Scaffold this active site. Structure first.
Site, mmCIF file in Angstrom:
data_model
loop_
_atom_site.group_PDB
_atom_site.id
_atom_site.type_symbol
_atom_site.label_atom_id
_atom_site.label_comp_id
_atom_site.label_asym_id
_atom_site.label_seq_id
_atom_site.Cartn_x
_atom_site.Cartn_y
_atom_site.Cartn_z
ATOM 1 N N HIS B 299 0.842 -1.196 0.000
ATOM 2 C CA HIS B 299 0.000 0.000 0.000
ATOM 3 C C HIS B 299 0.882 1.252 0.000
ATOM 4 C CE1 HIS B 299 -3.725 2.225 1.159
ATOM 5 N NE2 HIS B 299 -2.850 3.068 1.695
ATOM 6 N N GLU B 300 1.897 1.297 0.875
ATOM 7 C CA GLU B 300 2.807 2.441 0.961
ATOM 8 C C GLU B 300 3.649 2.575 -0.313
ATOM 9 O OE1 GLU B 300 0.792 3.136 4.311
ATOM 10 O OE2 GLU B 300 1.961 4.549 3.086
ATOM 11 N N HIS B 303 1.500 4.285 -2.892
ATOM 12 C CA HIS B 303 1.512 5.748 -2.733
ATOM 13 C C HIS B 303 2.809 6.353 -3.267
ATOM 14 C CE1 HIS B 303 -2.199 6.253 -0.658
ATOM 15 N NE2 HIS B 303 -1.833 5.710 0.513
HETATM 16 ZN ZN ZN Z 1 -2.988 5.037 2.023
#
Ligand code: ZN
Ligand code: 7WK
Ligand code: 7WK
Ligand code: PRO
Ligand code: PRO
Ligand code: CL
Ligand code: CL
Ligand code: CL
Ligand code: ZN
Lengths: 344, 348
Positions: B299-300, B303
């Protein structure tokens, strides 16, 4: 800036960082030594797999003209290259205790005597204090240590696929024997490369070495008696059930009576008929005798002693690591599924 | 010719290593078996990703997409992770008896206060079939474990700060063990594997990038529990670190076992990595590595590659933590792939 290895301070971390960066396309690495550099194009060896007690060991090659190979495990790394025909190894262990132990182990034979030219044969390498690696020129070391001439005199006993065939080479640490991973891996690498150099044999076979301990120990110093007992121990071992068609080596650090370095059943492995643990032998793994496992593997694959003193299969121990006999090369390749019409 | 198999009632490190070390370039069929369970998986070496944890080499293995199975193999541990009836099940086996015992106790401890009746389907110590006294592996179903445990709701709410080649580009993902933190290799490598696979699943991105994860320790520690202040300090520590000189264009993660204040699982600089302009340690974030939150590093990393929060609750980039490990947003997939050198005309 091209990646480099400084041989005046080379550590395990230095070798691991560089070799772990080698991708599918290979990597240029400069070996730096007292102001002189050698550019080597390093590639992962995708033909051979090695586990030592389940620890994964990866091999790396330079181009043929580079005369350079590497070994990398989690615990150690090796750089081995030739200079004036002599084999020079840089051996680096990751853990400080083990690196210190290895440095003391390799230094000890030289402390008995006091050579004026000791550094060209053996040197503890320090970071730019405890050693970070050792440099050993085994050809120069053997001249300083004046070792007894260990040879291969009677070291044998008579008895196109799209995907290469995997053949396991099951090495068994003899009961009570201590072997060093850099030494065992070097024997395995030299053994595998002596096979691939013949008739493009990587198309037919990919060798997978594994190392375990066995309860078997030779009942005497006699190599013939030892091999008889070893092959008998494999037939009676429940752990080997279902693997009677693989290749086996009993390994130790030392040698057998009459300075015999190893022994094997001659012409005992064929890809179509391998059975009954026939493809078995024994080999020393000590650093000063590179190529013993390669020589014994040659006999298992059908190679006889050769007349060229530069041949791996010469009846005397030389330190040469490749088959030169065309007769032996044809025998070995035919036993691995190759035919003349296939070419090289 | 009998197909190779893994017995999940007795699976050990040696079992997984001998099977995975036999996987050649062409792949290998392996049957996973348990009581009432079977799955034939075609296993292949993952040649796209490289991993070292403190210089220890860790290899990844994949099944076919339909197999929903991945493996991790190090000298010290092995992991089998597969999905069954929508749930993630991991078999974690350490080679050394002391470390396997420590790992088994570590995973068993949260369950010893909440003695659930259905504990075995969420967590089970696995023993060998012939002896067993000491465990050879642990089975953890994270989805069932989260229902038994009263874990606080850890989420991704404000976890982002707004600041064809013939050979894929190697991009290092330099993970740094926070000062004073203890992480487990099976946990760190699972986060890395999920992060890498979330990228390769998008627009055939293995043609453009091969991720190389490394793990070292850093002297940096977040000065507080605040993730925003922690990330600020972490990126500043990279700029001031002589060990990182010459690598300002790589991706960085500060990792820990735990989470940050407000149960924040991780944080990163949004849209901070582009293959042509990467610089000044901008592509940096922080991530938990605990087993119960798979996909946080993925997830990171999403981003960092420019992905925004997505509205599909099954998306990896959903603003709430879900346990889903793949990008579903076409907008995010195009942003991520363009930042890695892909163009629409290249296809998938
Ligand atoms: Zn997030
Ligand atoms: C003492 O002999 C052995 C000792 C030992 O521990 N093992 C496991 C042996 C063995 O296994 C290799 C096998 O797992 C394959 C080839 C699939 O990787 C085969 C043959 C012999 C042994
Ligand atoms: C605390 O940070 C670091 C600690 C540390 O030990 N090293 C080595 C770092 C580092 O090196 C990676 C480098 O060896 C490559 C990319 C060639 O594999 C880069 C960035 C940071 C570090
Ligand atoms: O490779 C290294 O970094 C350390 C130094 C001495 C032992 N191993
Ligand atoms: O230096 C030499 O003559 C020996 C021969 C092979 C290996 N080195
Ligand atoms: Cl010695
Ligand atoms: Cl045995
Ligand atoms: Cl640091
Ligand atoms: Zn001979």
């Amino acid at each position: 800036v091209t990646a480099s290895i400084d041989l005046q301070s080379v550590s395990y971390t230095d070798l691991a960082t560089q070799l772990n960066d080698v991708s599918d396309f290979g990597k240029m690495i400069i070996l730096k030594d007292n102001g002189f550099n050698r550019q080597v194009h390093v590639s992962m060896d995708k033909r051979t797999k090695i586990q030592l007690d389940n620890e994964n060991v990866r091999l790396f090659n330079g181009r043929d003209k580079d005369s350079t190979n590497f070994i990398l495990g989690d615990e150690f790394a090796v750089l081995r290259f030739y200079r004036n025909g002599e084999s020079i190894s840089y051996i680096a262990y990751k853990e400080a205790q083990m690196m210190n132990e290895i440095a003391e182990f390799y230094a000890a034979p030289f402390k008995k005597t006091r050579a004026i030219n000791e550094k060209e044969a053996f040197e503890c390498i320090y970071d730019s204090k405890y050693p970070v690696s050792v440099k050993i020129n085994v050809d120069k070391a053997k001249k300083i240590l004046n070792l007894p001439e260990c040879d291969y005199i009677n070291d044998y006993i008579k008895t196109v696929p799209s995907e290469p065939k995997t053949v396991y080479v099951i090495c068994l640490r003899e009961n009570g024997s201590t072997v060093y991973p850099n030494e065992v891996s070097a024997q395995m690498q030299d053994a595998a490369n002596s096979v691939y150099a013949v008739h493009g044999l990587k198309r037919y076979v990919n060798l997978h070495f594994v190392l375990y301990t066995t309860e078997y120990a030779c009942p005497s110093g006699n190599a013939d008696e030892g091999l008889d007992g070893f092959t008998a121990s494999l037939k009676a071992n429940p752990k080997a059930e279902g693997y009677d068609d693989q290749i086996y080596f009993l390994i130790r650090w030392g040698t057998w009576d009459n300075n015999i370095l190893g022994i094997s059943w001659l012409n005992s492995y064929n890809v179509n008929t391998a059975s009954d643990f026939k493809a078995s032998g024994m080999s020393t793994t000590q650093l000063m005798y590179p190529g013993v496992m390669a020589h014994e593997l040659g006999h298992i694959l059908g190679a006889n002693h050769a007349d060229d003193p530069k041949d791996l299969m010469y009846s005397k121990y030389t330190g040469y690591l490749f088959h030169l006999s065309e007769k032996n090369m044809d025998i070995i390749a035919k036993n691995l599924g190759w035919e003349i019409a296939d070419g090289d």
